[PDB]
Amino acid sequence: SCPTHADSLNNLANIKREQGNIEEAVRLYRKALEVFPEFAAAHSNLASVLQQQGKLQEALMHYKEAIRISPTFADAYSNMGNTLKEMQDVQGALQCYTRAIQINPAFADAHSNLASIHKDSGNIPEAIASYRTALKLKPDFPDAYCNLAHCLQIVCDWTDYDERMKKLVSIVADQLEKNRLPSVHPHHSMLYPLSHGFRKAIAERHGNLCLDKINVLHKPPYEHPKDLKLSDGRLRVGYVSSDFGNHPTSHLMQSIPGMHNPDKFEVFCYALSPDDGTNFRVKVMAEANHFIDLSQIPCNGKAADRIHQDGIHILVNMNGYTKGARNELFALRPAPIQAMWLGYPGTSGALFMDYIITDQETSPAEVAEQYSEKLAYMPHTFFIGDHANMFPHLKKKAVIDFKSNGHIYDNRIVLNGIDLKAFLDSLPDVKIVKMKALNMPVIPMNTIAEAVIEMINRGQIQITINGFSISNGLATTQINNKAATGEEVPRTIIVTTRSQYGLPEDAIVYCNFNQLYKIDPSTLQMWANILKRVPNSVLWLLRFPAVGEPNIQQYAQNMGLPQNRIIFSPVAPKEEHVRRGQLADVCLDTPLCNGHTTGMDVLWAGTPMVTMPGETLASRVAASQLTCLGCLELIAKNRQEYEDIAVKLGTDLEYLKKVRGKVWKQRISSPLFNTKQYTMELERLYLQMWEHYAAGNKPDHMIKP
């Protein structure tokens, strides 16, 4: 006679929940618990709804109850683990998942959640193993399948790549059509060939998650400022980010807040992360007009209240669908204008985002349908890097002519340093090669060059020559850790050699320092063609992660490349990573997802970068950087043009010297690394948006001055 009154109420609550009547769902659940307090299923369902609402504490209460009533409730163990994981109790979530797997060895969801924990912690083989186990238990598991696909992309395991991609598109279509949450994360949707509508829709659903979480607050709409009267005519701009610290975003824009014009702007910085003690956070705190630690205010309602009370006119989302994001603050709309700027290379798909700050090269109006927001164009490029501030020691270089009778090489033994000129002025016979006010000094093979090479070869940390401090490029962390992270400018003269990284002393070096997930079989095919067409040339990659290295090599061997044609290096500290890019000849950008910060890094080294812009924002950033640089010859309209440009740079050494010098000059001459100019143009765009809103208009595309 299984049906009871409580069973009926729990069902009716399930129906109202699938209808989207979440409040009626919780009311009916609670009524069912009233009829039957020891109703384990009602406890579990109410806990699931509460966890979806963000009421994690009460949800954990109800999950623990439901598991008290039914100790074999494996699903309740798995969902309690999920709630504890959302509460940052990773140990408790792990225990929940393993207890569920112990109780029911056939339960796939717990295996998938364990794989999720492994993947979050960086154990990709373990995550792959547990995802495979879950899919073996439950072959139709879209979440496990998509997460496994991302793990394989991370490690560059392209076995059955085409079938995997087609299944991914089919799964996304099926879940969109059935109004379930898509199993592909928006940040990953740029790596798969979905329609631009598919990517926009995934972004929309993930923003709807934030909307559902903020609805429980029942906050009224905020009264937004209609003029700048209360702020002395200053536009109040608040940058919201979890990356004020040692994070790439700070490496891009840390100088921007201090360069804002105080007469017309008031700069607020809302950190979603605690102080990590690094100089990036210190700089942002000390240069912004106001720093607000929203990490002390976990309640999205109260943090949105603080943003509103500060009187922000333009709120800037620099997190998007990345880690540490709190888009719930933006879903509460505490500011009249809300704009996506820098950290997320994609659309938010969400209504609470008015603008996305981009440029004509990254997002031409033709593809304005990819983005839910209105386009707000920067004059040259929306990308910026702080390299001129973080690494001024790479503005000039010098080399040693190790190969006694060797035409001058610019990237085999390189020296950098703030005091390099004084050191060279202490040297007897420095030769000065003019590059067509810019020049490269060359140290001939003296006892001094022999001492430097001995320091490099013997693996010594540092030496002294004529009272000057000479440092091994591999020993920066041992000399000044702050210098290695980019928190400080190095105070010694650093030596970087190809011998340090196994690069050919006599061959062309193609480099790509991006995370290996940006590589797909088509990209490796193009690189293989380029390597075949250029003799002795090698490709320089990073162990990013190291478990991806064998995969690449295996595939590279099937295409006819010996293991010696690809040189892998470990990931280095930031300063060493940017510095060692000088050793390469040409960088080959990933077409599937361009190197964005990596592109800035390689261009700062003076290394020409070849890109093929795609359709997604992430696939066109390198092209936009190259246009802003003034190097249109490095942008390819197709795969064949990409390969042709790469092999021309590799084989025509005079053209290679010309283009390398062009990049070496344009990285200073162009606005690409000019943070003051970028801040001023961003201020122009800000005032454009504010005047458009102040005239009573709804947000619209902002192009032309």
């Binding site: 190790f402 190969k403 033994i413 090479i453 490099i456 070869n457 693996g459 010594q460 940390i461 091994n472 591999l474 020993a475 041992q478 050699t497 011998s499 340090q500 990284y501 196994g502 002393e505």
Partner: peptide, 11 residues
Amino acid sequence: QRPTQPVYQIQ
């Protein structure tokens, strides 16, 4: 061995 030791030596 040592983190500063190079991959190969120069002539």
